[PDB]
């Protein structure tokens, strides 16, 4: 028996990832009790994001600019490129503070079943970026379709000069063997680095 407007707002809210229809309702109700400033501003912020910020031409990471801060930035080496599934993934690797290279962001992981070939990911323009005497670190997720995408990219990239690497599969920080999954364990065990 809901006001039409309400049902719209709720639906749109429910479209967002993470919002259960329940949550979407609660969220709309609360959205109501708020002033018109509050709203006109939220909606404004959205529209201004839609309009302003876009995808960098070099690595397809987000920016309002003509080149993502990371590409433009001079302290960084074009000697290496880290290929990664999504922008959040750049943020996450960057927080680690442990990587000074460049990035490439696909925005997808090959899924045939979901209809996703590399006509969909940003795989094509990666190619002219690689050449003789560079590294390409392959940073897709440990998910099957990630791993797969990694593989496909190794094979695609082989012809052109660069070295090719895969971020280590293994056990994360502050884990115990007791409480880690057989698969991961196996990988870590085989993939062990030797020292002496």
């Amino acid at each position: 028996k809901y006001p039409p407007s309400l049902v719209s707002l709720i639906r749109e809210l429910s479209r967002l990832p993470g919002i259960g229809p329940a949550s979407a309702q609660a969220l709309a109700f609360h959205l109501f009790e708020q002033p018109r400033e509050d709203i006109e501003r939220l909606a404004s912020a959205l529209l201004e994001a839609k309009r302003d910020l876009h995808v960098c031409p070099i690595c397809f990471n987000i920016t309002d600019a003509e080149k993502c801060d990371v590409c433009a930035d001079p302290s960084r080496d074009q000697r290496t490129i880290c290929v990664v599934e999504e922008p959040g993934d750049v943020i996450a690797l960057e927080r680690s503070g442990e990587y000074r290279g460049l990035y490439h962001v696909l925005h997808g992981v090959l899924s045939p079943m979901n209809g996703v070939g590399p006509d969909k990911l940003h795989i094509k323009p990666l190619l002219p970026r690689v050449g003789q005497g560079m590294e390409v670190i392959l940073a897709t997720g440990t998910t099957v379709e990630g791993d797969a995408t990694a593989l496909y990219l190794q094979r695609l990239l082989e012809p052109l000069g660069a070295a090719i690497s895969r971020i280590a599969y293994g056990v994360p920080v502050g884990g115990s063997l007791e409480y880690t999954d057989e698969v991961t364990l196996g990988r870590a065990l085989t993939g062990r680095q030797t020292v002496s």
């Binding site: 994360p172 920080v173 502050g174 884990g175 409480y179």
Partner: protein, 214 residues
């Protein structure tokens, strides 16, 4: 509300076979010991988290733990023993001013990076003690009161005079440090290290001093 989130460093970590992890944090708001059932919350992490307090549960629960920074190097054997020490201080002093936090913080930083870890641990050791209001007493013998005692004191962990002393005098380097010890800045107190050869005396020294106070 009874639910607060704060910034910290894990100066203690423990488990009960259930899989529940009790933990002691050092925050600028003082030390705080919170429990969580299940940053993966690692010893020496610089972390921050939401924790829930109340009469419901008298040891604070833990909801979301998130890592800010961390120092891996501290595992390698040297820097390791020294860390565990520094944190044991942070736990014994600073009884749950932010100053202590920024200090012990600095301690872990320097015991991680700086090339002479044992020196970091001596200096920061006595600064950690000092800010916490425990000062080695030097100018007056512990027994008779004679100025400029130069000998070890087994019982009190202070300094005795050759007349009131069983053991020989702490070497000049160790003495000079001991005396001018708590006055100098970290900056310029790192520039004046005790020779390697004379540290062991100075260690054995600090050990009983602490044992007897703390």
């Amino acid at each position: 509300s009874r639910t607060a989130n704060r910034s910290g460093i894990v100066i203690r970590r423990r488990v009960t076979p259930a899989g529940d992890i009790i933990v002691t944090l050092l925050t600028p708001q003082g030390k705080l010991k919170a429990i969580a059932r299940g940053s993966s919350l690692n010893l020496f992490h610089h972390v921050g988290v939401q924790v829930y307090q109340g009469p419901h549960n008298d040891l604070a629960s833990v909801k979301q733990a998130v890592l800010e920074g961390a120092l891996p190097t501290l595992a390698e054997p040297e820097r390791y023993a020294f860390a565990h020490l520094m944190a044991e201080f942070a736990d014994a002093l600073f009884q749950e001013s932010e100053q202590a936090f920024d200090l012990f913080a600095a301690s872990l930083r320097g015991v991680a990076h700086q090339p002479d870890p044992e020196w970091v641990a001596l200096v920061m050791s006595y600064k950690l003690l000092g800010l916490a209001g425990v000062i080695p007493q030097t100018a007056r013998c512990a027994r008779c009161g004679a100025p400029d005692p130069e000998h070890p004191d087994p019982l009190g962990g202070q300094l005795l005079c050759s007349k009131c002393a069983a053991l020989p005098p702490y070497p000049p380097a160790v003495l000079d440090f001991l005396r001018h010890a708590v006055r100098r800045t970290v900056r310029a107190s790192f520039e004046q290290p005790v020779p390697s050869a004379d540290r062991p005396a100075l260690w054995r020294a600090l050990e009983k001093f602490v044992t007897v106070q703390v």
